[PDB]
Nucleic acid binder design. Structure first.
Ligand SMILES: Cc1cn([C@H]2C[C@H](O)[C@@H](COP(=O)(O)OP(=O)(O)OP(=O)(O)O)O2)c(=O)[nH]c1=O
Ligand SMILES: [Mg+2]
Length: 726
DNA sequence: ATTTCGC
RNA sequence: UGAGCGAAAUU
């Protein structure tokens, strides 16, 4: 990277590239071979410039533990070659699976936006957004080399990609990859299958894959369902954790227990996905033409060569499995797995347990497909046979050994057959789920989730006891090491906590900070902002309060994509959380008992609203669809008129003397609304209290939950407001 | 620019 | 060593 920061080398390489490009633009060869020669010449010139600058300045197949340098290379290579060799060929049988189920097609506009030619403005947003300080690819070039040689590379890379779209082939250098072996987290190193194969490609191939990945990500929301939250932008991990906790609670509270929960785990899902099946399901999804023409070309003859201890092992074909490290690979994998997800959802034999008017079948991630069943005796068998069919078609293999399960039955003898038939390893206490121990009983969540947290704190604080750093250094270590772990647990499980937990956590943190000494400066002063002179000592109580109150944003937005908020158990009238934020205070309705996660949010919302001394029941941000105006009889058709004409707030429709008449568009829309509704709305807005409640400047707190339509920094803003208030 | 987590 | 996607926090 130091060589690239030389101005003379910079100018020399610029001149060399210009010369090289304006020397042999003939017609005998193509742009791909020219680009390969370009890369080779640049490598040679870089080697020469570096020289000038320096002048100026495991167990084998039999199980035996072998240490022979040649034998280990021969066995790991054989294992990986056998892993990447089996390629399916029953293309006729593949389409039979697809034709039996429904898939979401794309309209003409979407494919048209998918097949638009690559322009010069679609590469500037990719090269600049390329992460730096990474490892070089097989060629040896770095991302910053493209980043800082941007002024001339773009309008010839444009022609190179033009050639790729027009003809349909890629340079032979775009297929090379490097595989490095890495030890997994918490596994024995003696087994050959315990390593993590990571792959690195060329930077230009990464740029092309990023362009395609963004082009398909613009519609990935329409493509796959909202159950899957892995790699989908705008979705968070706890979306499924909270849902699973709600299902656990519902099963626990049910008097008739005949349910089961299975945490299915795939066995090397990335490396076991058949390329022909992914191509055919991409074709079936309505994607055809230029996009398919290039995607098929990028997976024609992918090769990879392993590197161990700096050895250039010979390459072998990748006949199967999407090459990991590809920005486009997660999208294709999600598309392929969406077929299985929709097959499970559409199947009537698989019966999910109904949560009131909402029915939940299964939850998804990258691989952690957890599925909730009813009457396991036949539902588990149907799921297993469907997964077997999908396995034969596509190669998706499940590691039944690692897959755990929860059995919820009342009869002792009925459980015996269930354990005997299904090969699942039924767990009794805990199942790991994205770092959250899903307790079999809800009442043990605090015991098995936060006490081990505190134990790990008391261990890791013992680990960093002999670091000769400043107290600001220890504060920073706290901030970037211990805070995210607690915030993740709060986000996943924001339940009521006794004050002893916070007291002892604060005690441990303060012992960490002062290094077995007493406080030197006031805690309150250091807890203030940097402008006040403090170093902003974290306040875990405020973070907990912010995390608990964060659910009000999703309450107000009323997004249909999320289903976790509707899974709460309610033996009472239907959904209430929609008409709670900035709505009429409804009486004679007491939540709790059944609730585990939302009632505490409402209590904490009311407490902070009262501390703000502002009215939370009639605000300028009140929705038209609020209960404030449908308590009096109205017609549904009236609301959607001003919803699509003016907006959703109660301020824009009109209050006081501006009832549905404040702008020429509203003046022309006034007669559209029905008169019987108009006489009601008028009278409603004639009241002095309504006018003074609506016509005011909203505070920052209201703007946090109302005007913002993005979650990028909700906890930060809410915690800042809480810190200002408290 | 950096950190952590999930995969 | 050490790559990719997504999420969160500090500046
Ligand atoms: C953890 C991890 C996963 N991945 C990708 C590759 C994996 O196929 C995918 C999910 O991996 P996992 O399902 O977490 O691991 P695995 O299924 O291979 O475990 P096992 O060896 O027992 O079969 O995410 C990375 O690219 N980098 C990573 O660091
Ligand atoms: Mg797996």
């Amino acid at each position: 990277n130091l060589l690239l920061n030389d101005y003379w080398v910079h100018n020399e390489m610029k001149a060399e590239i210009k010369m090289f490009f304006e020397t042999n633009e003939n017609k005998d060869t193509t742009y791909q071979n020219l680009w390969d020669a370009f890369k080779a010449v640049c490598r040679g010139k870089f080697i020469a410039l570096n020289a000038y600058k320096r002048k100026q300045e495991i167990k084998n197949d039999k199980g035996d533990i072998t240490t022979d340098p040649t034998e280990i290379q021969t066995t790991i290579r054989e294992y990986y070659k056998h892993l990447y060799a089996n390629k399916l060929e029953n293309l006729e049988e593949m389409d039979t699976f697809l034709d039996t189920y429904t898939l979401p097609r794309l309209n003409q506009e979407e494919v048209e936006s998918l097949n638009r030619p690559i322009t010069g403005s679609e590469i500037v947003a990719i090269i600049n957004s390329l992460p730096t300080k990474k490892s070089p690819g097989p060629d040896g070039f770095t991302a910053e080399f493209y980043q800082r040689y941007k002024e001339e590379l773009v309008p010839f890379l444009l022609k190179l990609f033009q050639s790729i779209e027009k003809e349909g082939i890629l340079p032979n250098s775009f297929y090379e990859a490097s595989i490095i072996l890495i030890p997994k987290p918490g596994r024995d190193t003696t087994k050959k299958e315990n390593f993590r194969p990571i792959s690195l490609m060329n930077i230009d191939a990464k740029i092309l894959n990023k362009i395609l990945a963004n082009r398909i990500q613009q519609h990935i929301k329409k493509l796959i369902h909202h159950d899957q939250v892995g790699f989908i932008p705008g979705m968070q991990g706890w979306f499924n954790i909270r849902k699973s906790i709600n299902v656990i609670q519902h099963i626990n509270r049910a008097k008739d227990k005949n349910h089961v929960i299975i945490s299915i785990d795939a066995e090397k899902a990335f490396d076991k996905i058949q390329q022909p099946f992914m191509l055919k399901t991409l074709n079936k999804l309505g994607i055809d033409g230029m996009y398919l023409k290039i995607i098929r070309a990028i997976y024609d003859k992918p090769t990879a060569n392993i590197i161990l201890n700096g050895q250039k092992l010979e390459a072998f074909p990748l006949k199967t499995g999407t090459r990991q490290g590809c920005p486009l690979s997660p999208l294709l994998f999600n598309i392929v797995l969406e077929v299985l997800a929709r097959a499970i959802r559409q199947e009537k034999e698989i019966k999910g347990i109904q949560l009131g008017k909402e029915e939940v079948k299964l939850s998804l991630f990258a691989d952690d497909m957890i599925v909730y069943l009813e009457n396991p005796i036949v539902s588990a068998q149907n799921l297993l046979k469907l997964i077997s069919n999908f396995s034969k078609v596509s190669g998706y293999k499940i590691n039944v050994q690692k897959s755990q399960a929860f059995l919820y039955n009342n009869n002792r003898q009925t459980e015996s057959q269930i354990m005997g038939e299904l090969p699942f390893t039924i767990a009794s206490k805990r199942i790991k789920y994205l770092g959250i121990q899903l307790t079999r009983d809800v009442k043990d969540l605090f015991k098995e989730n936060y006490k081990p947290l505190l134990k790990e704190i008391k261990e890791d604080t013992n680990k960093w006891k002999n670091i000769p750093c400043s107290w600001v250094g220890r504060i920073n270590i706290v901030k970037m090491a211990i805070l995210p772990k607690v915030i993740y647990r709060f986000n996943a499980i924001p339940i009521k906590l006794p004050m002893t937990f916070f007291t002892e956590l604060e005690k441990t943190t303060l012992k960490f900070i002062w290094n077995q000494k007493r406080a030197r400066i006031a805690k309150s002063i250091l807890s203030q902002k940097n402008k006040a002179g403090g170093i902003t000592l974290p306040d875990f109580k405020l973070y907990y309060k912010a995390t608990v109150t964060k659910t009000a944003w999703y309450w107000y937005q009323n997004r249909d994509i999320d289903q976790w908020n509707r899974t709460e158990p309610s033996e009472i009238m239907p959904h209430i959380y929609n008409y709670l934020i900035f709505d009429k205070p409804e009486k004679n309705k007491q939540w709790g008992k059944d609730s585990l996660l939302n009632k505490w949010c409402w209590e904490n919302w009311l407490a902070i609203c009262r501390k703000l001394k502002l009215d939370p029941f009639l605000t300028p941000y009140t929705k038209i669809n609020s209960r404030w105006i449908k308590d009096l009889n109205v017609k549904p058709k009236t609301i959607k008129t001003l919803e699509e004409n003016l907006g959703i707030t109660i301020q824009d429709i009109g209050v006081g003397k501006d009832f549905m008449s404040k702008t020429p568009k509203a003046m022309a829309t006034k007669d559209k609304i029905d008169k019987w509704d108009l006489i009601k709305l008028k009278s409603f807005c004639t009241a002095k209290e309504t006018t003074i409640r609506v016509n005011r400047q909203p505070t920052t707190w209201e703007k946090i939950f109302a005007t913002y339509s993005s979650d990028k920094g909700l906890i930060s803003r809410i915690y800042n407001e809480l810190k200002q208030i408290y």
